[PDB]
């Protein structure tokens, strides 16, 4: 393998024959297994499981756990530090395992959407992984295509390759094919760049780790995530709680102080207040809510590249989709062709193939037999990028459909006889592309240029038409009639383009334009239907004419009978609070070029919608990046997208944006659902153990009891709430707003009132066992114990905010009805086992005490499921 | 319009001899264009085999030399003809129409629901 240095510097055949690289066939099967034997595959090897499971400790609240038991060693508390460390590891292991299946799930989702590239080896072009590739083999570059491996390009007709994912500029780069002697290798085509425009045709110089720039994308591989913004925005919350509560502890201490108490008691109750009150599974149950619900959409066939979109998916109301790619399968064929002599050809045959033949008033048309058609093929086949090469389409759909068209008529062969010198690419800003040209045969003739693009943007550049083969100035008449004809095209749903050939830019004939029909995707119809029905709105936003725009999504159905559409330049004319009135109404956008699309996209943006864009095509990647949410297709999405995207639609489904936006609602209901109960409990034993200590009764808790209370309401028990499975309800809710509003009036309102129905009943217990003047290890029991199961059953009102309980039944989520027996047998072992009693310091209980502890715990039960039947009722 | 229904199509050893028919409502006379398509996983569709306005039947590479195409206004079902089948060219079969079309641009575009042909080693 060589270097990119020395490639440069070799020529094309030297590097061909050190690689024994066949350029016109590429390499057999047996030479290719036989290079996969020494060299392998193009992997970077292999990807920190014990770094990934150390980097849940890195947490603030976690370091805060770690430092009240590092205080609790120092101040030699064994049985504090333990329960505190098994805490920490039991909720630490929770987020591993889920993160874990989570980011296995998302691999193995994305083996079934592999990198790949055209390889042409036994003379076949193929398409094929660029894992596979070995050196010395060729492989074509089209527009829009991810380079799979260090290239020695060979051929560039045109080429602009980003280095922005290499370099750091953001500048395309020209690459030239020839060799450049001593960033700067023109005519290397760096592993992993995206290919902006044109074709070209390399041999690879290296595999595996002998790419130039293989150390950036191994950084790129292990750069992590940055926090999801509603992840920072619980850090927050967390540290507020913890803050407060460390507040109120503090109040404690000086409270107990002053009054008199052992400091050493008050010290370890304080820290076992500490260490509870500290929401130390927030973060946790945030994550793992965020890693099942990409699980769900990994099940719908998603692969959410990046997690910030789970807490966004909810919050969708707005898609703008593209006409071309995403609402369209996107598989172009020419189908009408109208002259510039007002001849009529009706093309035929599906496809990118050559078998099907146009038709001219009955009359089957080959060569140049008629001379307009022949201009207008030959000006479509010359001024391309893309080539049908064994039946498989490299370029762009609209070009592969012209190829196909030039193949049918027979005049392919023609571009090869032209010398394309310069070169004026195609850009969504221009809407045009043409090409200079010599004669192969006969140099004599002057620079022909060969035109295509838009209506508008042609034929302002051309000054003259063809009438019967001869030149004649153009005319409006001429201009009126085909417009009309661009008009009625669009109408019946042909992408329409303009031909021209002459001399020089500016002075061009006009030869006809072309009729490309584009067939709506399948099951696309039904999506649309289904997401207006789901309360969400779809735009269509397009840089193609207002017939075809128009037709298509009347077909489709976002765009009704009486529906307003607005053009590009009109978006350009207007400012921006008008376009911000104007917006939402407006169902198909045309003629929008990516700087429009990114208008309309942060106009939708600034109306507190949440965008998701649906798009397709190199140019539509910036506003896949501007878009909140940048959806890609799976089987027909170009690598430039893919990798522009937030999220890949495997199958190429619009159902599975519905999918996946109904995914994205419940993760707010489950962490409130945490959030209440975790709040509720706490601040329970924060306000029983600061009346304890104000009114000097004894504490009602000791440290290990308020310990295992911390492990209950942030361990299983509390972390089950957030694995709660999502009702149906919900899903019929309209869009959650991007504000968390988390703690909400009403969840503090339940909070407050389940804290208070807690410490009532408690205090209740343990006045009426400490009504004799004896502070009893039956008293402490029996208090704890009614604590304990005030948790639990506060966690089963906590499953749900508004559904009932006996709706949902007791088994609908089992790891909550497992981490609940869990809990009541760790309390039946703290009761009973003689080294448990003796570490919590407790007595046995008789049975009609427990049966009198779960008549009374019952309580809170009943109290939350009458006021959520009274909130119910008020709102029917 | 013209309905058309595809049939014939079933599993087939390799080096037999299969059969396929595509039968429309209205007599086939006036479509100039009318061809099978194989479609199959991981690929797009490809062409079989058809028939031209002036008589000249068009066949793809892949498949030239093995499949035989013929129509017959009596029967108005056009009917296919493979031999010397291999498992590496076998797929779900659509036979597809277009009739000749002056003022409107609607594609007469019809397309039949397909057969399935599955080979094995």
């Known amino acids: 393998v060589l270097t990119s240095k020395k490639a440069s510097e070799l020529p094309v055949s030297e590097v061909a024959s050190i690689l024994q690289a066949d350029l016109q066939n590429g390499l057999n099967k047996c030479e290719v297994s036989h290079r996969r034997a020494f060299h392998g595959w193009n992997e970077f090897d292999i990807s920190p499981l014990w770094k990934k499971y150390i980097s849940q400790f890195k947490n603030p609240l976690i370091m805060l756990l770690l430092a009240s038991a590092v205080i609790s060693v120092l101040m030699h508390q064994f049985d504090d530090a333990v329960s505190i460390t098994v805490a920490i590891l039991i909720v630490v292991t929770v987020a591993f395992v889920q993160e874990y299946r989570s980011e296995k799930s998302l691999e193995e989702l994305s083996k079934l959407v592999p990198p790949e590239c055209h390889c042409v080896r036994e003379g076949k072009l193929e398409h094929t992984l660029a894992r596979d590739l070995v050196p010395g083999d060729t492989v074509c570059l089209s527009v829009g295509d991810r380079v799979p491996a260090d290239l020695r390009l060979f051929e560039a007709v045109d080429l602009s390759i980003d280095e922005s994912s290499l370099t750091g500029e953001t500048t395309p780069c020209s690459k030239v094919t020839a060799p450049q002697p001593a960033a700067s290798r023109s005519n290397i085509a760096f592993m992993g760049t995206l290919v902006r425009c044109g074709k070209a045709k390399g041999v690879v110089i290296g595999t595996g780790e002998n790419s130039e720039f293989g150390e950036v994308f191994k950084m790129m591989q292990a750069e992590e995530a940055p926090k999801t913004p509603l992840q920072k925005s619980m850090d927050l919350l967390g540290k507020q709680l913890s803050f407060y509560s460390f507040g109120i502890i503090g109040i404690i201490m000086l409270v107990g102080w002053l009054l008199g108490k052992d400091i050493l008691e008050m010290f370890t109750i304080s820290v076992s207040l500490a260490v509870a009150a500290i929401p130390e599974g927030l973060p946790i149950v945030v994550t793992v809510t965020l890693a099942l619900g990409v699980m769900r959409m990994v099940k719908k066939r998603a692969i959410v590249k990046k997690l910030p979109i789970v807490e966004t998916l909810g919050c969708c109301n707005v898609i703008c989709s593209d006409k071309t790619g995403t609402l369209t399968k996107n598989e172009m064929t020419v189908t009408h062709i109208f002259t510039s002599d007002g001849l009529h050809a009706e093309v035929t045959g599906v496809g990118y193939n050559q078998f099907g033949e146009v038709i001219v008033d009955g009359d089957v048309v080959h060569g140049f037999y008629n001379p307009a058609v022949s201009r207008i093929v030959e000006a479509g086949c010359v001024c391309n990028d893309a080539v049908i090469r064994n039946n498989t389409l490299m370029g762009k759909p609209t070009e592969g459909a012209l190829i196909a068209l030039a193949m049918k008529m027979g005049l392919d062969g023609l571009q090869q006889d032209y010398i394309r010198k310069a070169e004026y690419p195609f850009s969504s800003e221009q809407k045009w592309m043409a090409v200079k040209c010599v004669h192969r045969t006969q140099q004599d003739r002057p620079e022909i240029c060969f035109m295509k693009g838009a209506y508008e943007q042609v034929i302002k550049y051309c000054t003259t038409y063809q009438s019967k083969g001869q030149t004649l100035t153009l005319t409006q008449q001429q201009r009126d009639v085909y417009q009309q004809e661009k008009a009625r095209m669009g109408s019946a749903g042909l992408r329409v383009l303009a031909l021209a050939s002459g001399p020089e830019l500016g002075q061009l004939t006009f030869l006809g334009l072309v009729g490309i029909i584009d067939p709506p995707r399948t099951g696309v119809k039904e999506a649309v239907t289904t997401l207006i029905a789901s309360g969400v709105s779809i735009k269509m936003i397009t840089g193609d004419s207002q017939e075809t725009a128009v037709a298509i999504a009347s077909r489709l159905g976002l765009y009704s009978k009486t529906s307003q559409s607005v053009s590009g330049e009109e978006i350009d004319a207007m400012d921006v609070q008008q376009l911000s009135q104007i917006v939402p109404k407006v169902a198909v956008f045309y003629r929008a070029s990516p700087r429009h699309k990114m208008k309309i996209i942060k106009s939708l943006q600034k109306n507190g919608s949440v965008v998701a864009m649906t798009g397709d095509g190199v140019n539509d990647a910036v506003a896949l990046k501007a878009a909140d949410i940048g959806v890609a297709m799976g089987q027909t999405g170009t690598d430039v997208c893919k990798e522009a995207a937030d999220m890949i639609l495997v199958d190429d489904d619009f159902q599975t944006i519905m999918s996946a936006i109904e995914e994205g609602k419940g993760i707010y209901n489950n962490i409130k659902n945490f959030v209440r109960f975790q709040l509720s409990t706490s601040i329970a034993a924060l306000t029983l153990i600061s009346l304890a200590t104000l009114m000097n009764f004894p504490n009602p808790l000791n440290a290990m009891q308020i310990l295992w209370i911390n492990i209950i309401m942030d361990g299983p028990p509390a972390q089950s709430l957030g694995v709660e499975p999502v009702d149906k309800d919900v899903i019929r809710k309209p869009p959650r707003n991007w504000k968390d509003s988390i703690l909400t009036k009403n969840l503090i309102l339940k909070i407050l009132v389940s804290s208070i129905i807690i410490v009532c009943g408690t205090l209740f217990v343990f006045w009426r066992e400490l009504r004799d003047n004896v502070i009893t290890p039956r008293d402490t029991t029996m208090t704890f114990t009614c604590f304990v199961f005030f948790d639990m059953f506060n966690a089963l009102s906590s499953r749900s905010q508004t559904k009932s309980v006996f709706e949902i039944g007791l088994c609908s989520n089992r790891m909550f009805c497992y981490a609940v027996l869990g809990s009541i047998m760790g309390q039946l072992l703290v009761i009973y086992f003689p080294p448990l009693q003796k570490v919590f310091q407790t007595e046995s209980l008789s049975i009609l005490d427990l049966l009198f502890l779960l008549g009374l715990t019952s309580s809170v039960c009943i109290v939350a499921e009458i006021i959520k039947k009274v909130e119910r009722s008020r709102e029917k | 319009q013209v309905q058309l229904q595809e049939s014939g199509g079933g599993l087939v050893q390799a080096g037999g001899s299969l059969r396929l028919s595509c039968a429309a409502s209205?007599?086939?006379?006036?479509?100039?264009?009318m061809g099978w398509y194989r479609q199959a996983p991981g690929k797009e569709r490809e062409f079989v085999a058809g028939?031209?306005?002036?008589?000249?039947?068009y066949y793809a590479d892949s498949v030239k030399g093995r499949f035989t195409i013929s129509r017959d206004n009596a029967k108005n079902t056009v009917y296919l003809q493979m031999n010397s089948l291999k498992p590496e060219d076998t797929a779900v079969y659509y036979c597809?129409?277009?009739?000749?079309?002056?003022?409107?641009?609607?594609?007469?575009?019809?397309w039949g629901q397909g057969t399935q042909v599955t080979v094995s080693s």
């Open positions: 597809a129409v277009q009739y000749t079309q002056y003022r409107s641009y609607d594609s007469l575009l019809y």
């Open positions: 209205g007599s086939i006379f006036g479509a100039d264009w």
């Open positions: 028939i031209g306005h002036g008589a000249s039947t």
